[PDB]
Amino acid sequence: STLYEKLGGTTAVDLAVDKFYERVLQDDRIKHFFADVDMAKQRAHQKAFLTYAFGGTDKYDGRYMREAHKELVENHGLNGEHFDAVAEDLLATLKEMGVPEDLIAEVAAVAGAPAHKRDVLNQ
């Protein structure tokens, strides 16, 4: 199954989520998409994204993805350049964790997959 077991338990998951959260928070390309939400919810998001990318797709229905990002698309100007910045932040986090470049490619293909990018971007 999912995230806890793929990364190797509680501490490892928290490490991945915190590093990802940190990088995105400091990323001027995209930090503003989180301006109207609290810090706890910003981290919860990076956790969700990470879970998805590692293969916990199940709980993130495309229709829910479309709706969940609709205000970003309509109100914050969310586009593909932004989507890519977040994907790239995740992969940079996993590299900074020593995760193998092949295995980063595996999640890179998931997180950045056309049907999901299409849903997030309200294409």
User: Known binding site: residues?
Assistant: 45, 69, 116
Tell which positions 7-66 bind K ion, by CB under 5 A: 9-11
DSSP secondary structure, 51-119, as one string:
HHHHT-GGGS-HHHHHHHTHHHHHHS---HHHHHHHHHHHHHHHHTTT--HHHHHHHHHHHT-HHHHHH
How many Å apart are CA 104 and CA 110, to the nearest integer? 10
Alpha carbons 98 and 15: distance in angstroms, whole number: 12
Token look-up 């590692």 returns 54
Q: Would you count residue 94 as binding ligand HEM (CB under 6 A)?
A: no
Q: List, as residue ranges, the binding site for heme.
A: 45, 69, 116
Please pick, from the candidates 49, 91, 93, 107, the single residue that binds ligand HEM as defined by CB under 6 A: 49
Q: How far is the CB of 23 from ligand HEM (least distance, A)?
A: 12
Please, which of residues 17-36 interact with ligand HEM by CB under 6 A?
30, 33-34
Which of the listed partners (K ion, ligand HEM, none) does 10 bind, with a CB threshold of 5 to 8 Å by partner kind? K ion
Binding site for K ion (CB under 5 A): 9-11
Binding site for ligand HEM (CB under 6 A): 30, 33-34, 37, 41, 45, 48-49, 52-53, 60, 65, 68-69, 72, 78, 82-83, 86, 111, 116, 120
